[PDB]
Amino acid sequence: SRANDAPIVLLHGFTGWGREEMFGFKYWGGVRGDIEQWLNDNGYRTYTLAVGPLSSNWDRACEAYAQLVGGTVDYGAAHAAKHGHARFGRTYPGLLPELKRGGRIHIIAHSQGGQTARMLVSLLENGSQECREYAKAHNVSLSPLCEGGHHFVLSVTTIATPHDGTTLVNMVDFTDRFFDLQKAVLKAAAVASNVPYTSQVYDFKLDQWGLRRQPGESFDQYFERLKRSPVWTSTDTARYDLSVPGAEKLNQWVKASPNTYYLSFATERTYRGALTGNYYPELGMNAFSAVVCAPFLGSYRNATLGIDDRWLENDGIVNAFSMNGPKRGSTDRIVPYDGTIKKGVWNDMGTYNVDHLEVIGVDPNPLFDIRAFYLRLAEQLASLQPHHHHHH
């Protein structure tokens, strides 16, 4: 029973690109196909957001808001001044004008997109105090995203999200490995990193930072520049927010809204040793993560940061423990799924035996029925009721 008709909006993580990009190879489906199309085909209106993969959740949230209702992206004057990037970014037609007219949406987010979705909701409802103050004080204008009072989001579903960050960021060679992961994902799309394609192919959307791939520059080369850029060296980055300390900081202000349903899906593609207590990558995990990231994730302990044995189980990219919802520096409630989806709390939907990329189809896994997974999910979302009544 379909209790609602709101559309679904897909939101990628630290890798991701629009439907026209990457020669049509979809982030949402990868080698499996087109998740969006599947859903639409089954009666579930579905759209796709594309925002800065490497940008800070804040940056992304602003981009998302503009992309959704239309308009010129406004990163906030206080923010922009604080971090040293442009206040105004690209312009968007707007995907869903129904939003300004009282319609709502369901957001389905992968990886870091989960952090972004949460933030979007928080800003939409509550705005930003810092933002508002600075405006009043300096006589500058404010985006409605900073004011609050919106009623746009019915639910948020996160999949393989580092709510509490990912120890991946602690690798000695994280900078280089992280970009190799981007190269990996290009590779998946049948796209080379040593070729100076004239077409855009994969736009990092770094307009605020004044960065873009140049004529004659390969992705390898471009990445070499990015590594030394503010989108990697500043705190206003995905790098920072993805870290354990960064995620905590974000958790301190990004709270679950009582007017919104939250569903959390975890992922794991590992086994435990006996002699070590470490977690190891399972056969089938994506090649990149199996060699380069999983070993580390499955063995990295840090008493100070709070990284114990609980954090070892991983999906090749994110520690499973981080995925059920924000906990580090968080007041949000998390409840194990009991058949009943509850509002204003993290409905912990459990852990699935799929890797970070398999779950979106970017890496194959013939044993994972992806279509069924998204379809079951869509039905869940579409079943969500406006309100409830106590009963025995």
Q: Where are the beta strands (DSSP E) in 316-361?
A: 334-336, 346-352
* Closer to Ca ion by Cβ: residue 56 or 267: 267
Q: Is 83 annotated as a binding residue?
A: no
Closest contact distance (angstroms) between CB of 16 and Ca ion is 19
- Is 356 noted as a catalytic residue in this protein? yes
Instruction: Name the DSSP class of 65.
Output: H
Contact 146, 131 (CB under 8 A): yes
Q: How far apart are CA 13 and CA 17, in angstroms?
A: 10
Burial classification of residue 196, based on how many CB atoms lie within 10 Å of its CB (0-12 exposed, 13-18 middle, 19 or more buried): middle
- Is 229 noted as a catalytic residue in this protein? no
Is residue 365 close enough to count as binding Ca ion by CB under 5 A? Answer: yes
Q: How far apart are CA 216 and CA 82, in angstroms?
A: 33
Q: Is 79 annotated as a binding residue?
A: yes
* Closer to Ca ion by Cβ: residue 71 or 364: 364
Q: Among 243, 238, 260, which Cα is nearest to 328's?
A: 243
Q: How far apart are CA 267 and CA 274, in angstroms?
A: 22
236 binds, among Zn ion, Ca ion, none (CB under 5 to 8 A by kind): Zn ion
- Is 106 noted as a catalytic residue in this protein? no
Which window, 187-195, 200-208, 256-264, 358-366, contacts Ca ion (CB under 5 A)?
358-366
Q: Is 392 annotated as a binding residue?
A: no
Which window, 33-41, 125-133, 198-206, 278-286, contacts Ca ion (CB under 5 A)?
278-286
Q: Which of 114, 284, 316, 326 binds Ca ion (CB under 5 A)?
A: 284
Query: How many other C-beta atoms lie within 10 A of the C-beta of residue 91?
Result: 12
Is residue 241 close enough to count as binding Ca ion by CB under 5 A? Answer: no
Q: Is 236 annotated as a binding residue?
A: yes
Pairing of strands 153-159, 105-110: parallel
118 binds, among Zn ion, Ca ion, none (CB under 5 to 8 A by kind): none
Contact 332, 346 (CB under 8 A): yes
Is residue 361 close enough to count as binding Ca ion by CB under 5 A? Answer: no
Pairing of strands 279-281, 270-272: antiparallel
Single-letter code of the amino acid located at 244: V
Name the residues that contact Zn ion, by CB under 5 A. Answer: 59, 83, 236
Closest contact distance (angstroms) between CB of 281 and Ca ion is 10
Q: Is 34 annotated as a binding residue?
A: no
Which window, 47-55, 74-82, 140-148, 277-285, contacts Ca ion (CB under 5 A)?
277-285
Single-letter code of the amino acid located at 252: Q
* Closer to Ca ion by Cβ: residue 248 or 363: 363
Q: How far apart are CA 155 and CA 349, in angstroms?
A: 14
Q: Is 138 annotated as a binding residue?
A: no
* Closer to Zn ion by Cβ: residue 46 or 237: 237
Which window, 65-73, 170-178, 334-342, 353-361, contacts Ca ion (CB under 5 A)?
353-361
Distance of CA 100 to the CA centre of its chain: 24
Q: Which of 207, 248, 348, 363 binds Ca ion (CB under 5 A)?
A: 363
Closest contact distance (angstroms) between CB of 31 and Zn ion is 33
Q: How far apart are CA 76 and CA 186, in angstroms?
A: 32
* Closer to Ca ion by Cβ: residue 315 or 348: 315
Q: Which residue of the set 203, 207, 241, 315 is catalytic?
A: 315
Single-letter code of the amino acid located at 194: N
* Closer to Ca ion by Cβ: residue 203 or 363: 363
Q: How far apart are CA 82 and CA 360, in angstroms?
A: 35
Here the tokens at position 106 are: 């369901």
Q: Is 5 annotated as a binding residue?
A: no
The radius of gyration of the chain's CA atoms, rounded to the nearest angstrom, is 20
- Strand-pair partners of 88: 74
Closest contact distance (angstroms) between CB of 81 and Zn ion is 10
Closest contact distance (angstroms) between CB of 286 and Ca ion is 6
363 binds, among Zn ion, Ca ion, none (CB under 5 to 8 A by kind): Ca ion
Contact 47, 107 (CB under 8 A): no
* Closer to Ca ion by Cβ: residue 241 or 363: 363
Q: How far apart are CA 11 and CA 27, in angstroms?
A: 10
Q: Is 364 annotated as a binding residue?
A: yes
Please report, in range form, the residues annotated as the binding site for Zn(2+). 59, 79, 85, 236
Positions marked active-site: 111, 315, 356
Annotated binding site for Ca(2+), which residues?
284, 358, 363-364
Contact positions toward Ca ion, by CB under 5 A? Answer: 284, 358, 363, 365
